[PDB]
């Protein structure tokens, strides 16, 4: 449809030009709604053509902004939903069992309703992820604890606000320079009565010796349990590992991406050097190369626990969750 | 058939195709034994297959042959569970074995295609000894028009590292040969380590040539990623607590010169198998899924 | 004194007493050069001694020779600081050199008598290659009526490990020979590692045969004490930042095969020298005390 096409182009341009849905949950919701509209409006005779068109718009969406993995995650979730619905309606993972024991394009005229119902169920599950994560705050925070945060994470903010109803603790927030969004987080936490401290990134390793545990958010969870987080999270994780401080990642399930850390030089988001070195410096900007990476790679061995809407897991289990969310044939997309 | 011609078939099939691995040849020999058995009972078939696996593992002391034998026994047990009647079971086992043979043949190309992406342009690659899967990975990488250097170790008990260096020079890839005592010296030059495996133990560690453990320890000490390429038919439910806990049938006959050692899963970054790229914790799950 | 007779004297003193080490032979050759120099100025004396040290290090590419060269130059500098007149300074130098030679000749037995008490009854000792100081400490430990089993590495590029095994079986000490690649396999059976060193750098690390770093890292990974027995005159004021920072004159001529490697002081428990039992941090202090 023309309206569907204009909505797709609006989404693509919003992704390309930055901004858009500030919260990752909002953009996941928008991606799911767009995918539902594409499924409804477009004409597809069978499951294979629907798969091909979903993959085509998913490729365009991912090429719009590769650093935002949520869109590709939702596209792959919809593809896996289509796979499971078609398999359940028509017929009856690579393992040793399958290897020892050992097709689409058959039209059924009943798959669309099941696909839409599954997408709606996914949307309802997506709506309550933050409350589900926050409900586990008291199991991980004790009396007079010291928590450490970097930047502004809405899930971690909800976590701490829910924990603060019954326990008293201290929170140290490190500003995520240059976009010092930790100031907003510290002000918001102080509004709720939690005693809070503002400090720079350079002080992280200076104060980790007096921190009990580190609770952080992330942008992406990779297939091996690695993280794409805000820049400065890798050094914070290294400092926590130096002191054996437990590092907890509060991240919903829709931030799990089936790719591997093999990709390089496009992982980080490089933005204008104005954030690091102002334009008013003058002539020295001619011969100075200044880079401003927005994201950081965190190896899985630096993460102690993952708290999601389904509970707590170790990084070593992340692979299984991957196999429970995405088909291996959709990793390349 | 008979023990003599069983061993002869094993050796001849290994000889006629020097590319095919020992485990693949053992599985093919066991499938050929199954084809011509003239038996009527699944109990006698199981006993005779166990005896044939014992003979084959007596011919050569490799972990991969025993792993393939256990996998074959599990395959037979699963097929027997599916079909009660032996006459119907036999044909199903034969066709399933043919498909299994084709899949384990394609495993090497699957591993190479999946693994070649982790090595960059200008990267320095460290290998330990001769490994056909590592060679396939490097061939796929150079086919992808990537430029990199490779270091190999001489692998003193049998200079198979020199064989690997010759095979790599045959394709004109820049390679270097270092002593078995130079690994710790050369680790800082390299960016990642790629080794093969003769067998993957239950907890995610690996069994491989005697120099693998020290290379893994050095890579961990200098924070270098340690990658292992291994086929799925090398999964064994063995749990070595230490080096001495490794069965002696795999150390010797394959002052004191063991042929293999064991590497713990904590020293391994990722494993590249025909099932995909796995964490060491996945392997155990696989085994737990296979044996109910 | 001609250059030819200098090389001839060096080689003759090395060959006549194989027990005596290369550094002692170099220092003896330098003192013999100083014995008959027919000169009148200390400036030309220092220049001639420096040139003799360069040609001697041309003869042998060992770190110990250069260690002795710098130590001897410092000895001349201090002696000149003591006395301005050339004749009195020269006689002071010859007496001091004779005393210095006497004291450095008996360092090995002091290290043995101070280090044999760290060996326990029924211990399992791992060592890298041939080192006369380790032979001496093991002989003293046996003379202390102690029973232990020694493991040694074959030291592939020149099988000095086999020579160590023969020289240890000469006294009927139970010894075993393992490959260079089997070191990581053997660490868990050994109780402690004792090695020598061709040179002790400023920060407390050591320069030794190419396989020492692997053993140090493996022992650290397995929590085993790592003891280094070395002489005082092997104290170079070098500060290698990594394996590449080692001077190339010591790696080669003594595909690409380095002959030495550097071990960081954090991988070393104690150093057994004629000065005593020291932590690595002491060594630097010594050098700081030597050069004002």
Curated annotation (Swiss-Prot), chain A:
Activated by the chemical integrated stress response (ISR) inhibitor ISRIB which stimulates guanine nucleotide exchange factor activity for both phosphorylated and unphosphorylated eIF2. GO terms for molecular function: ATP binding; GTP binding; guanyl-nucleotide exchange factor activity; translation initiation factor activity. InterPro entries: eIF2B_beta_subunit, IF-2B-related, IF_2B-like_C, NagB/RpiA_transferase-like. GO terms for cellular component: cytoplasm; cytosol; eukaryotic translation initiation factor 2B complex. Keywords: Cytoplasm, Disease variant, Initiation factor, Leukodystrophy, Protein biosynthesis. One of its GO terms (biological process) is oligodendrocyte development. Changing residue 153 to F: In VWM2; with ovarian failure. Pfam families: IF-2B (PF01008). The keyword Protein biosynthesis applies. It is found in: Cytoplasm, Cytosol. Changing residue 195 to G: In VWM2; with and without ovarian failure. Gene3D superfamilies: Translation initiation factor eif-2b, domain 2 (3.40.50.10470). SUPFAM superfamilies: NagB/RpiA/CoA transferase-like. It is linked to Leukoencephalopathy with vanishing white matter 2: An autosomal recessive brain disease characterized by neurological features including progressive cerebellar ataxia, spasticity, and cognitive deficits. Brain imaging shows abnormal white matter that vanishes over time and is replaced by cerebrospinal fluid. Disease severity ranges from fatal infantile forms to adult forms without neurological deterioration. The disease is progressive with, in most individuals, additional episodes of rapid deterioration following febrile infections or minor head trauma. Acts as a component of the translation initiation factor 2B (eIF2B) complex, which catalyzes the exchange of GDP for GTP on eukaryotic initiation factor 2 (eIF2) gamma subunit. Its guanine nucleotide exchange factor activity is repressed when bound to eIF2 complex phosphorylated on the alpha subunit, thereby limiting the amount of methionyl-initiator methionine tRNA available to the ribosome and consequently global translation is repressed. Component of the translation initiation factor 2B (eIF2B) complex which is a heterodecamer of two sets of five different subunits: alpha, beta, gamma, delta and epsilon. Subunits alpha, beta and delta comprise a regulatory subcomplex and subunits epsilon and gamma comprise a catalytic subcomplex. Within the complex, the hexameric regulatory complex resides at the center, with the two heterodimeric catalytic subcomplexes bound on opposite sides. Belongs to the eIF-2B alpha/beta/delta subunits family. This is Translation initiation factor eIF2B subunit beta. It comes from Homo sapiens (Human). The gene is EIF2B2.
UniProtKB/Swiss-Prot annotation, chains B, C:
One of its GO terms (biological process) is response to peptide hormone. Acts as a component of the translation initiation factor 2B (eIF2B) complex, which catalyzes the exchange of GDP for GTP on eukaryotic initiation factor 2 (eIF2) gamma subunit. Its guanine nucleotide exchange factor activity is repressed when bound to eIF2 complex phosphorylated on the alpha subunit, thereby limiting the amount of methionyl-initiator methionine tRNA available to the ribosome and consequently global translation is repressed. PANTHER family: TRANSLATION INITIATION FACTOR EIF-2B SUBUNIT ALPHA. The keyword Cytoplasm applies. Belongs to the eIF-2B alpha/beta/delta subunits family. Pfam families: IF-2B. Disulfide bonds: none annotated. It is linked to Leukoencephalopathy with vanishing white matter 1: An autosomal recessive brain disease characterized by neurological features including progressive cerebellar ataxia, spasticity, and cognitive deficits. Brain imaging shows abnormal white matter that vanishes over time and is replaced by cerebrospinal fluid. Disease severity ranges from fatal infantile forms to adult forms without neurological deterioration. The disease is progressive with, in most individuals, additional episodes of rapid deterioration following febrile infections or minor head trauma. This is Translation initiation factor eIF2B subunit alpha. Keywords: Acetylation, Cytoplasm, Disease variant, Initiation factor, Leukodystrophy, Protein biosynthesis. Activated by the chemical integrated stress response (ISR) inhibitor ISRIB which stimulates guanine nucleotide exchange factor activity for both phosphorylated and unphosphorylated eIF2. It is found in: Cytoplasm, Cytosol. One of its GO terms (molecular function) is identical protein binding. The modification N6-acetyllysine is found at residue 35. Component of the translation initiation factor 2B (eIF2B) complex which is a heterodecamer of two sets of five different subunits: alpha, beta, gamma, delta and epsilon. Subunits alpha, beta and delta comprise a regulatory subcomplex and subunits epsilon and gamma comprise a catalytic subcomplex. Within the complex, the hexameric regulatory complex resides at the center, with the two heterodimeric catalytic subcomplexes bound on opposite sides. GO terms for cellular component: cytoplasm; cytosol; eukaryotic translation initiation factor 2B complex; membrane; plasma membrane.
């Amino acid at each position: 449809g023309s309206e569907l096409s204009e909505r797709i182009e609006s989404f693509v341009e919003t992704l390309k030009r930055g901004g858009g849905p500030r919260s990752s949950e909002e953009m996941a919701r928008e991606t799911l709604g767009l995918l539902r509209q594409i499924i409804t409006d477009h004409r597809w005779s069978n499951a294979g053509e629907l798969m091909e068109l979903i993959r085509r718009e998913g490729r365009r969406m991912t090429a719009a902004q590769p650093s935002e993995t949520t869109v590709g995650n939702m596209v792959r979730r919809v593809l896996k939903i289509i796979r499971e619905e078609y398999g359940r309606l028509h017929g009856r993972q690579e393992s040793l069992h399958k290897l020892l024991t050992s097709d689409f394009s058959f039209h059924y005229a009943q798959l669309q309703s099941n696909i839409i119902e599954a997408i709606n169920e996914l949307l309802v599950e997506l709506e309550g992820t933050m409350e589900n994560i926050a409900a586990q705050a008291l199991e991980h925070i004790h009396s007079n604890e010291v928590i450490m945060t970097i930047g502004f994470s809405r899930t971690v903010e909800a976590f701490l606000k829910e924990a603060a109803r019954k326990r008293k603790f201290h929170v140290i927030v490190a500003e995520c320079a240059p976009f010092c969004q930790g100031h907003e987080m510290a002000v918001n936490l102080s509004k709720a009565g939690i005693e809070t401290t503002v400090m720079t990134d350079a002080a992280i390793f200076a104060v980790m010796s007096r921190v009990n545990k580190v609770i952080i958010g992330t942008k992406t969870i990779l297939a091996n349990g690695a993280l794409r987080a805000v820049t400065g999270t890798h050094t914070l994780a290294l400092a926590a590992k130096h002191h054996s401080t437990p590092l907890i990642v509060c991240a919903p399930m829709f931030k799990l991406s089936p790719q591997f850390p093999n990709e390089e030089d496009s992982f980080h988001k490089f933005v204008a050097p104005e954030e690091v070195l102002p334009f008013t410096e003058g002539d020295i900007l001619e011969k100075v190369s200044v880079h401003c990476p927005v994201f950081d790679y965190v190896p899985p061995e630096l993460i102690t626990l993952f708290i999601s809407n389904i509970g707590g897991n170790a990084p070593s289990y992340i692979y299984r969750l991957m196999s429970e969310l995405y088909h291996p044939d959709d990793h390349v997309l | 058939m008979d023990d003599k011609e069983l061993i002869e078939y094993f050796k001849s099939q290994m000889k006629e195709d020097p590319d095919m691995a020992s485990a693949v040849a053992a599985i093919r020999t066991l499938l050929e034994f199954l084809k011509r058995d003239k038996g009527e009972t699944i109990q006698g078939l199981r006993a005779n297959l166990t005896s044939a696996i014992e003979t084959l593992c007596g011919v050569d002391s490799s972990v991969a042959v025993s792993s393939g034998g256990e996998l074959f026994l599990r395959f037979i047990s699963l097929a027997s569970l599916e079909y009660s009647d032996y006459s119907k079971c036999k044909k199903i086992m034969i066709e399933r074995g043919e498909l299994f043979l084709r899949r384990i043949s394609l495993s090497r190309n699957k591993i190479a295609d999946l693994c070649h992406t982790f090595i960059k342009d200008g990267a320095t690659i460290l290998t330990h000894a001769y490994s056909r899967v590592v060679l396939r990975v490097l061939e796929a990488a150079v086919a992808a028009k990537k430029r990199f250097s490779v270091y190999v170790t001489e692998s003193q008990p049998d200079l198979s590292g020199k064989k690997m260096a010759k095979a790599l020079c045959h394709l004109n890839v820049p390679v270097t040969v270092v002593l078995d005592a130079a690994v710790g010296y050369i680790m800082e030059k390299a960016d990642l380590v790629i080794v093969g495996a003769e067998g993957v133990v239950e907890n995610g560690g690996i069994i491989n040539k005697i120099g693998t453990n020290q290379m893994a320890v050095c890579a961990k000490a200098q924070n270098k990623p340690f990658y292992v390429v291994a086929e799925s038919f090398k999964f064994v439910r063995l749990f070595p607590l230490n080096q001495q806990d490794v069965p002696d049938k795999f150390k010797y006959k394959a002052e004191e010169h063991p042929w293999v050692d064991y590497t713990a899963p904590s020293l391994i970054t990722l494993l590249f198998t025909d099932l995909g790229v796995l964490t060491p914790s996945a392997v155990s799950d696989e085994l737990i899924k296979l044996y109910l």
